[PDB]
Each structure stands twice: as structure tokens, then as C-alpha cells.
């Protein structure tokens, strides 16, 4: 049963949520190999865990920079959620720790690269290819939302491809445990629900809207609302108009009309029957939900294995020292980390 599985997952989550793992490794247990991606207050590096020889992705945040960007609470959210959570289609937190200068989150390494890189190169995904990925997101949101978590940053840049060609959602820097509504202006312009841009209190429905943006982008090769500047994107998102490619199937267009619905009483995922409205839509008729969860379905794209520690599916970034001050920074701000 889905209800039964969720019930026991929430039991597992709550224990870890209320008593979070802390200080479970140290920087010099890892060999730093290469930068896999960059962000505002931090980067992500391929590292090797020397004691086991396992490869991992280590997220490094400069505490001083987190503070300047007013992301203290959000960073504490990210770590506290990721250590508590456990689901096949999320990058699992293996270790976390901090030193005088930085915060560290060590997650499983997905060597396939970002969906973003593959989507841009290939141009667009076929509907079966798009549906495969979409299903994995549908299930991840079902899991997360059942734990009262909102994700708030769905986009291809945040979806890593694993050696089996399945997805891992990563970057929980805006994820939050909220019962009820919340107000923070955050996310990525192309993927923002109308609620958010109009400064309403909002809820998990914004994640289902974001799913509609992603499915569209995967299947079209470009997003449903784009312009050169964010303001122009926001004017389009709140206009209530959306244009589908002629190659989009009837089923696709109708799923997206119900996902990209400005009206919350009508938006799929946010209705009385919740996520099943999405799972039982015709576009997903071919989808064996349990076989996807079980990773039994054959991936439409299996990434090139060139060994462990291969990074050829990721772009190159300018490498930058991990400097560790002799003085502790922001001890109080990050005490619970």
C-alpha cells in the first residue's frame, strides 16, 4: 500500500528530524578531486572517501557568505531535511560536518551529470523519455509532501542522472518543513508559481506547478515562459496564457493545462484526490508506478560509464582553494549544523 509505505517512511523521518545526525565526518577523510558545480554561497566537488574508496559529491558552503545572503535558516533546513530523508530519487546525505570557515554536506555521487546538460545538448526529450523522468519526480514529491516538506527549486539543473539512468533530485537549499502556508520569495524565475510572484502565502501546490514547467521543458526543449529578463518572464507566468508545440500530444497538453493552472482549486496535485489526479491521468497510463520506484523500468538513456571518479558528464569549473580560517566564523548561527 502507498498509504502504508508513507506511514512507515514518516516514522523513519520523524526520528531523524527530531534528533539530527551531526559531525559525522571530517574534511581530511576525503580526497578532493574536482568541482562539479557552482552556486551563490557554495560549490559541489567530487571527493573520495579514503577509508572506503567511495566517491561522493561534497557541497561546501562558506558560512560568512551564507550569512550575507540571508540563507542561515534555509541552510539549516537543507541539512536537517537531507539527513532525515531516504528515498531512491534524492541524493542521499552520507555525512555532514563543519569547520571554522565552511559547512559540508556529503551526498552520493551521480556520475551521469545534470539533466540540464543532456536536455540542452539533445534539444528535447521524447514523451516516453520525459514521462520516465516525470514519474520519478511525481513519486519524490509524493514522498516529500507527505512529510510536510516543500521542495521549491525543481529544474533540470537540480536533477542528476545516476549510472542506471535514473534521477536524483539534489539541492535542498530552499526546502522547508511547513504545515500550512509560507511566504518566502525563492526559486528560479522560469519555474515560479503565480502565487509566489504575487506575494501570496503559498503551499506545496507550487511544486506541482513547477512539475508542469519541467515536463513542458523536457518535452519542448524550452520552458513555457521565457524572456531575456526575469520581469518579462513573470508578466508571462501571471498572464494566464500558455502555448504548446504542435508536436505535443493531446494527453500532454491536458496534463500541462491542469498543472500549469493559476487557479489553486483546479490545479492538479492540490485537489481533493491530491497526487492520484496526476498518477491516474492518461499521459501516465503506461507507467508502472511500483516498477519505477523499484528501478525495474529500463532507462531510455544510460550514461557512459568510464569508471569510478569519472566526471566527463559534468562541465569544467574554475577550481578554488578550500581555505579554513584559524578563527571560528559564525559559530552561533550554525550551532545546530
Amino acid at each position: 500500500s502507498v498509504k502504508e509505505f508513507l506511514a512507515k517512511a514518516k516514522e523513519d523521518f520523524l526520528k531523524k528530524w527530531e534528533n539530527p545526525a551531526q559531525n559525522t565526518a571530517h574534511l581530511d577523510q576525503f580526497e578532493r578531486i574536482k568541482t562539479l558545480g557552482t552556486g551563490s554561497f557554495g560549490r559541489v566537488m567530487l571527493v573520495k572517501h579514503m577509508e572506503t574508496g567511495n566517491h561522493y559529491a561534497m557541497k561546501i558552503l562558506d558560512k560568512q557568505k551564507v550569512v550575507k545572503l540571508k540563507q542561515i535558516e534555509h541552510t539549516l533546513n537543507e541539512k536537517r531535511i537531507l539527513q532525515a530523508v531516504n528515498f531512491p530519487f534524492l541524493t542521499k546525505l552520507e555525512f555532514s560536518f563543519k569547520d571554522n570557515s565552511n559547512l559540508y554536506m556529503v551526498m552520493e555521487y551521480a556520475p551521469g551529470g545534470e539533466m540540464f546538460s543532456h536536455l540542452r545538448r539533445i534539444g528535447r526529450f521524447s514523451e516516453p523519455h520525459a514521462r520516465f523522468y516525470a514519474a520519478q519526480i511525481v513519486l519524490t514529491f509524493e514522498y516529500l509532501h507527505s512529510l510536510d516538506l516543500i521542495y521549491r527549486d525543481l529544474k533540470p539543473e537540480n536533477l542528476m542522472i545516476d549510472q542506471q539512468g535514473y534521477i536524483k533530485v539534489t539541492d535542498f537549499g530552499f526546502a522547508k518543513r511547513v504545515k500550512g502556508r509560507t511566504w518566502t520569495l525563492c526559486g528560479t524565475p522560469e519555474y515560479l508559481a503565480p502565487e509566489i510572484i504575487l506575494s501570496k502565502g503559498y503551499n506545496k501546490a507550487v511544486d506541482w506547478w513547477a512539475l508542469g514547467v519541467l515536463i513542458y521543458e523536457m518535452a519542448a526543449g524550452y520552458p513555457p515562459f521565457f524572456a531575456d529578463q526575469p520581469i518579462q518572464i513573470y508578466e508571462k507566468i501571471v498572464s494566464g496564457k500558455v502555448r504548446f508545440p504542435s508536436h505535443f500530444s493531446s494527453d500532454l497538453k491536458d496534463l500541462l493545462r491542469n498543472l500549469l493552472q493559476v487557479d489553486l482549486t483546479k490545479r492538479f496535485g492540490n485537489l481533493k484526490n491530491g497526487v492520484n489526479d496526476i498518477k491516474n491521468h492518461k499521459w501516465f497510463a503506461t507507467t508502472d508506478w511500483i516498477a519505477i520506484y523499484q528501478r525495474k523500468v529500463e532507462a531510455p538513456f544510460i550514461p557512459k560509464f568510464k569508471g569510478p571518479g569519472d566526471t566527463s558528464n559534468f562541465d569544467d569549473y574554475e577550481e578554488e582553494e578550500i581555505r579554513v580560517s584559524i578563527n571560528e566564523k559564525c559559530g552561533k548561527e550554525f550551532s545546530e549544523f
Binding site: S40, Q71, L185, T188, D228
Partner: peptide
């Protein structure tokens, strides 16, 4: 074409999160 306008836009690279 819509594809052409996208590819010619400034937002075909990785997109950064916003914040208030």
C-alpha cells in the same frame, strides 16, 4: 520559431535561484 527565440535568448545556460 520559438526554438530559435529561446536559443537566441540569454537564458539557455544554467539558471540561478532568486531571493528577496
Amino acid at each position: 520559431t520559438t526554438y530559435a527565440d529561446f536559443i537566441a535568448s540569454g537564458r539557455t545556460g544554467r539558471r540561478n535561484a532568486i531571493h528577496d
